[PDB]
Ligand binder design. Structure first.
Ligand SMILES: NCCCC[C@H](N)C(=O)O
Ligand SMILES: NCCCC[C@H](N)C(=O)O
Ligand SMILES: NCCCC[C@H](N)C(=O)O
Ligand SMILES: [Cl-]
Ligand SMILES: [Cl-]
Ligand SMILES: [K+]
Ligand SMILES: [K+]
Lengths: 292, 292
């Protein structure tokens, strides 16, 4: 649903740069097999920026079809224009999607008031649960805990993906929102720490290629078995880091291909192919995790 | 024209958020009469993010039509997807614009090699001059001088809007490009310093409301009369700063309204109306500049 290991799934593409169904089907089966709790479709790692609105909707609907009720699917619906965010969201109303992941507007650097009005308006145009998403390093914008508190009062604003890697945010937000508001890490390297502080899970890039370990680690964390969970975290830490050796999702797409999970590691410009050095780095990280 | 005071023009809107032709005409006539070198149409200050592709093109074409040959128009054509950038550019080929201002992809954080391939691909499918645009605070991405140097070898890549406010970039870039390559400030508050170091002009937010003073300041700077330019700059400095007291273009649209240059200060979400405290700040800066 909205806890545990949630995969920020890649959009696998053929050499032409269009979604590859066979690869998408292989990935989804793998997540179902591995115990992944849910899939985020066409979020950041799914190359949301470079899919047009129709292409974006198609990938989400295809993911939902292929999941075939076996695993929940959350749609990426973020946009930096409120009217676009509303349109994208309306696309998935009454679709089978369990919720939306919606990022703070990027580039235009809205005020906290603007963030409030943006997300409130979006929530008002849907019955679907909304997970806010803060990632200042990508957006130029930082959704502060006070504003998260203000927004958590909206009935269908139910959680946040917190990707700052600033762990003080966990308890700053938790103090301002109801006990059923969900706190999800958006930073693999700090996600276990985030859970140890009271977070409920992670929207993970690492989970694309270590789905079983990620699921197990989040289960252990949820049970309060943090020392056990850390053994797994330490095995995965090189992946947590080196999957960003080059811009995400360049490394994780290559890793998927290397593991036979997808047919090609093709991306859309301005993402470009992994370097030879990046290949060796990511391979060593996979070896360390015992995946290769 | 790619030197001197270039205005990063507002997209004046009515109360419903639709482009106001009468207000835009007034602004263009003001810039013609006040000595502005050129108009950037639908750039960052023009709310590029919240205009759809069709609306974007409409504003550029309206701006050309109204300019009626009296002032050069540069079109904002930036996108975080290389396909979108190319498509936008194709709409404006043979339109009458003199060039394009194209920002580094935002949100997806491409590598330097990605930036290279993005801008090379855009430049390839047009004869129009391209001005690169670097603004890490908005994009999450920093186009480094090394890569600017590489790109400058492409025939129609002819300049950069450098909005870091990091003044070391001026001569780091200058050393790597030909004498013909234009270096334009994208930070009003450091723009005169930027020109004193070798820069050729400024793509200015302040120029929306202080067009004549900006024009004179930049001419004095081009002539090496830095102490003289600095007197003007010091009267404008409150505005250079306070036009960002709330997210651009909120303050500057309000200021335009206050001077009678536009009918309404309306924006599109996620921009929201100026606060009262913001009104007071901006008003005081306008008075300091001798404009009210
Ligand atoms: N995936 C939907 C369309 C994205 C449009 C644009 N590239 C943006 O990032 O906002
Ligand atoms: N102005 C063209 C359409 C823009 C699409 C999207 N809002 C972006 O900022 O990239
Ligand atoms: N108008 C579309 C142009 C094609 C660009 C596309 N991004 C590519 O990789 O080829
Ligand atoms: Cl995501
Ligand atoms: Cl601009
Ligand atoms: K709520
Ligand atoms: K050139």
């Amino acid at each position: 649903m909205f806890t545990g290991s949630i995969v920020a799934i890649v959009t696998p593409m053929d050499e032409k740069g269009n979604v590859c169904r066979a690869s998408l089907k292989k990935l989804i089966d793998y997540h179902v097999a591995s115990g992944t709790s849910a899939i985020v479709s066409v979020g950041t790692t799914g190359e949301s920026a470079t899919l047009n609105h129709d292409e974006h909707a198609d990938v989400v609907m295809m993911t939902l079809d292929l999941a075939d009720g076996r695993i929940p699917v959350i749609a990426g619906t973020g946009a930096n224009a409120t009217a676009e965010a509303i349109s994208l969201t309306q696309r998935f109303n009454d679709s089978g999607i369990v919720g939306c992941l919606t990022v703070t507007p990027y580039y235009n650097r809205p005020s906290q008031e603007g963030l409030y009005q943006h997300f409130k308006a979006i929530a008002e145009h849907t019955d679907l649960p909304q997970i806010l998403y803060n990632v200042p390093s990508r957006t130029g914008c930082d959704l502060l805990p006070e504003t998260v508190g203000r927004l958590a009062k909206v009935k269908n604003i139910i959680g946040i993906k917190e990707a700052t890697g600033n762990l003080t945010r966990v308890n700053q937000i938790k103090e301002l929102v109801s006990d059923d508001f969900v706190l999800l890490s958006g930073d693999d390297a700090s996600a276990l720490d985030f859970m140890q502080l009271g977070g409920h899970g992670v929207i993970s890039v690492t989970a694309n290629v270590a789905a079983r370990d990620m699921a197990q680690m989040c289960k252990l964390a949820a049970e309060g078995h943090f020392a056990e969970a850390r053994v797994i975290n330490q095995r995965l830490m090189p992946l947590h880091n080196k999957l960003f050796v080059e811009p995400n999702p360049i490394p994780v797409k290559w890793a998927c291909k290397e593991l036979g999970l997808v047919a090609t590691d093709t991306l859309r410009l301005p993402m470009t192919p992994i370097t030879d050095s990046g290949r060796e780095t990511v391979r060593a990280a996979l070896k360390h995790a015992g995946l290769l």
